[PDB]
Design a protein around this motif. Structure first.
Motif, PDB file in Angstrom:
ATOM      1  N   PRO A 240       4.175  -9.343   4.256  1.00  0.00           N
ATOM      2  CA  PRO A 240       5.334  -8.891   5.040  1.00  0.00           C
ATOM      3  C   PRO A 240       5.089  -8.103   6.336  1.00  0.00           C
ATOM      4  O   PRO A 240       6.000  -8.025   7.164  1.00  0.00           O
ATOM      5  N   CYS A 241       3.900  -7.528   6.519  1.00  0.00           N
ATOM      6  CA  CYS A 241       3.685  -6.613   7.652  1.00  0.00           C
ATOM      7  C   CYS A 241       2.760  -7.133   8.764  1.00  0.00           C
ATOM      8  O   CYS A 241       2.086  -6.347   9.437  1.00  0.00           O
ATOM      9  N   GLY A 242       2.752  -8.450   8.965  1.00  0.00           N
ATOM     10  CA  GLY A 242       1.972  -9.069  10.039  1.00  0.00           C
ATOM     11  C   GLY A 242       0.474  -8.984   9.818  1.00  0.00           C
ATOM     12  O   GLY A 242       0.014  -8.856   8.680  1.00  0.00           O
ATOM     13  N   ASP A 243      -0.287  -9.053  10.909  1.00  0.00           N
ATOM     14  CA  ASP A 243      -1.749  -8.998  10.835  1.00  0.00           C
ATOM     15  C   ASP A 243      -2.339  -7.724  11.439  1.00  0.00           C
ATOM     16  O   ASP A 243      -1.672  -7.014  12.197  1.00  0.00           O
ATOM     17  N   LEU A 244      -3.597  -7.456  11.099  1.00  0.00           N
ATOM     18  CA  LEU A 244      -4.311  -6.271  11.566  1.00  0.00           C
ATOM     19  C   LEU A 244      -4.448  -6.231  13.089  1.00  0.00           C
ATOM     20  O   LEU A 244      -4.315  -5.169  13.699  1.00  0.00           O
ATOM     21  N   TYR A 245      -4.708  -7.392  13.690  1.00  0.00           N
ATOM     22  CA  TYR A 245      -4.879  -7.510  15.138  1.00  0.00           C
ATOM     23  C   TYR A 245      -3.688  -6.951  15.916  1.00  0.00           C
ATOM     24  O   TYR A 245      -3.855  -6.092  16.788  1.00  0.00           O
ATOM     25  N   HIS A 246      -2.495  -7.443  15.596  1.00  0.00           N
ATOM     26  CA  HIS A 246      -1.282  -7.047  16.308  1.00  0.00           C
ATOM     27  C   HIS A 246      -0.881  -5.597  16.039  1.00  0.00           C
ATOM     28  O   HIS A 246      -0.302  -4.944  16.908  1.00  0.00           O
ATOM     29  N   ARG A 247      -1.206  -5.100  14.846  1.00  0.00           N
ATOM     30  CA  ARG A 247      -0.935  -3.710  14.489  1.00  0.00           C
ATOM     31  C   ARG A 247      -1.798  -2.740  15.294  1.00  0.00           C
ATOM     32  O   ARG A 247      -1.310  -1.706  15.748  1.00  0.00           O
ATOM     33  N   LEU A 248      -3.075  -3.080  15.470  1.00  0.00           N
ATOM     34  CA  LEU A 248      -4.011  -2.216  16.199  1.00  0.00           C
ATOM     35  C   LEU A 248      -3.715  -2.138  17.698  1.00  0.00           C
ATOM     36  O   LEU A 248      -4.129  -1.190  18.369  1.00  0.00           O
ATOM     37  N   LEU A 249      -2.989  -3.132  18.208  1.00  0.00           N
ATOM     38  CA  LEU A 249      -2.552  -3.156  19.606  1.00  0.00           C
ATOM     39  C   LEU A 249      -1.525  -2.068  19.926  1.00  0.00           C
ATOM     40  O   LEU A 249      -1.415  -1.636  21.075  1.00  0.00           O
ATOM     41  N   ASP A 250      -0.772  -1.636  18.916  1.00  0.00           N
ATOM     42  CA  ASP A 250       0.162  -0.524  19.078  1.00  0.00           C
ATOM     43  C   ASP A 250      -0.614   0.790  19.212  1.00  0.00           C
ATOM     44  O   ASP A 250      -0.863   1.488  18.224  1.00  0.00           O
ATOM     45  N   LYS A 251      -0.992   1.112  20.447  1.00  0.00           N
ATOM     46  CA  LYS A 251      -1.801   2.295  20.751  1.00  0.00           C
ATOM     47  C   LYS A 251      -1.016   3.596  20.606  1.00  0.00           C
ATOM     48  O   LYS A 251      -1.596   4.650  20.328  1.00  0.00           O
ATOM     49  N   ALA A 252       0.299   3.508  20.801  1.00  0.00           N
ATOM     50  CA  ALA A 252       1.198   4.656  20.694  1.00  0.00           C
ATOM     51  C   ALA A 252       1.313   5.176  19.263  1.00  0.00           C
ATOM     52  O   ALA A 252       1.520   6.371  19.052  1.00  0.00           O
ATOM     53  N   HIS A 253       1.177   4.278  18.291  1.00  0.00           N
ATOM     54  CA  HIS A 253       1.287   4.637  16.877  1.00  0.00           C
ATOM     55  C   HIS A 253       0.003   4.310  16.107  1.00  0.00           C
ATOM     56  O   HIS A 253      -0.065   3.289  15.410  1.00  0.00           O
ATOM     57  N   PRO A 254      -1.027   5.172  16.235  1.00  0.00           N
ATOM     58  CA  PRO A 254      -2.286   4.919  15.538  1.00  0.00           C
ATOM     59  C   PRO A 254      -2.137   5.025  14.024  1.00  0.00           C
ATOM     60  O   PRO A 254      -1.404   5.886  13.527  1.00  0.00           O
ATOM     61  N   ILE A 255      -2.817   4.134  13.310  1.00  0.00           N
ATOM     62  CA  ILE A 255      -2.878   4.188  11.856  1.00  0.00           C
ATOM     63  C   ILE A 255      -3.630   5.457  11.454  1.00  0.00           C
ATOM     64  O   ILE A 255      -4.718   5.721  11.968  1.00  0.00           O
ATOM     65  N   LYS A 256      -3.041   6.249  10.561  1.00  0.00           N
ATOM     66  CA  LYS A 256      -3.676   7.493  10.124  1.00  0.00           C
ATOM     67  C   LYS A 256      -4.947   7.222   9.315  1.00  0.00           C
ATOM     68  O   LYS A 256      -5.103   6.148   8.722  1.00  0.00           O
ATOM     69  N   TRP A 257      -5.847   8.203   9.310  1.00  0.00           N
ATOM     70  CA  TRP A 257      -7.187   8.050   8.743  1.00  0.00           C
ATOM     71  C   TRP A 257      -7.216   7.551   7.294  1.00  0.00           C
ATOM     72  O   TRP A 257      -8.040   6.701   6.950  1.00  0.00           O
ATOM     73  N   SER A 258      -6.314   8.066   6.462  1.00  0.00           N
ATOM     74  CA  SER A 258      -6.285   7.718   5.040  1.00  0.00           C
ATOM     75  C   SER A 258      -5.878   6.264   4.788  1.00  0.00           C
ATOM     76  O   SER A 258      -6.343   5.643   3.832  1.00  0.00           O
ATOM     77  N   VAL A 259      -5.016   5.730   5.652  1.00  0.00           N
ATOM     78  CA  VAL A 259      -4.600   4.328   5.571  1.00  0.00           C
ATOM     79  C   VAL A 259      -5.690   3.413   6.140  1.00  0.00           C
ATOM     80  O   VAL A 259      -5.930   2.323   5.614  1.00  0.00           O
TER      81      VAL A 259
END
Ligand code: ACP
Ligand code: MG
Length: 278
Positions: free
Chosen positions: A95-114
């Motif tokens: 449901p949440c797309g792919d890792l590539y497109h998620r990492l492109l969102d520079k404004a909302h970085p994935i937190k360290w624990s995730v």
């Protein structure tokens, strides 16, 4: 290859077209039995295509079927079964797309624990692949081919390995040139017929580890002509620069995993153990 279930058009409910694949269309659907949301990948070789490309599309589709028929692991995209007319794969919808497109969102970085949850989930997937008899060589491990189930740290599954063509499972070593040289092992990209193993995926996983850690594309810090770029990776040991603030234990895992010598690339039991300690 094990038994693959067959589903008639009665057993699925088409919802919408969600994408366009290499060999055809991708649709969102629902399994009428248990209301499970699914991804339907169709094989459509239009008469606009040539001879060599059409046979490459069919063998691509079928390899994905043959390899995925034996696979059963929470961190690998699951095959529910097959359809006919047109030939289709019924996959689990992630449901949440792919890792590539998620990492492109520079404004909302994935937190360290995730980020750690993602690293471990992918490692577990590849560990399962390399523990098969014979081992599965993906040959296309990259951020667009990592699908995200959830970005919640407390989810059962966060990341799933996807896109198993170009993938191989043989008792003898494999061969062939691979395109995306920024993700692929040096022994795979040197414009020749060289032999390699599942250790090429271990190299790709190091690039996946880099891209999660930094949020950046591997080798994006460099700019070279294609021939020069491949030569630097092969003969000069050119690698993406690991930031100074990277945890020492993660840096070692990355460095060892992208070693020029494939024998020096660690077994995934070591990779999983080390990542869990982060
Ligand atoms: N299991 C799944 N769950 C959710 N979405 C999926 C999915 N499988 C495919 N999709 C969607 O369909 C799109 C079509 O791409 P696909 O999954 O066919 O990869 P691809 O074959 O285009 C990789 P490439 O052609 O670059 O080698 C994907 O980008 C994704 O958005
Ligand atoms: Mg592929």
């Amino acid at each position: 290859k094990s038994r693959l279930p067959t589903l008639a058009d009665n057993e699925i409910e088409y919802e919408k077209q969600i994408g366009k694949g290499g060999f055809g269309l991708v649709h969102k659907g629902r399994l009428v039995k248990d209301k499970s949301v699914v991804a339907i990948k169709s094989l459509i070789l239009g008469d606009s295509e040539g001879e060599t490309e059409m046979i490459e599309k069919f063998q691509e589709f079928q390899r994905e079927v043959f390899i995925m028929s034996n696979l059963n692991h929470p961190n690998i995209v699951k095959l529910y079964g097959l359809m006919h007319n047109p030939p289709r794969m019924v996959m689990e919808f992630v449901p949440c797309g792919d890792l590539y497109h998620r990492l492109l969102d520079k404004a909302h970085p994935i937190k360290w624990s995730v980020k750690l949850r993602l690293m471990l989930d992918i490692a577990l997937g590849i560990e399962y692949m390399q523990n098969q008899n014979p081992p599965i060589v993906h040959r296309d491990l990259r951020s667009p081919n990592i699908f995200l189930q959830s970005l919640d740290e407390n989810a059962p599954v966060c990341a799933k390995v996807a896109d198993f063509s170009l993938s191989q499972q043989s008792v003898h070593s494999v061969s062939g040139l691979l395109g995306n040289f920024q993700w692929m092992a040096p022994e795979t990209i040197g414009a020749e017929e060289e032999s390699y193993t599942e250790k090429a995926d271990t190299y790709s996983f190091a690039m996946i580890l880099y891209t999660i850690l930094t949020g950046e594309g591997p080798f994006d810090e460099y700019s070279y002509g294609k021939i020069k770029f491949i030569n630097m990776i092969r003969e000069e040991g050119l690698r993406p620069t690991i930031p100074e603030d990277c945890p020492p234990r993660l840096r070692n895992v990355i460095e060892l995993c992208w070693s020029g010598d494939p024998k020096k690339r660690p077994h995934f039991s070591y990779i999983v153990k080390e990542l869990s300690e982060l």
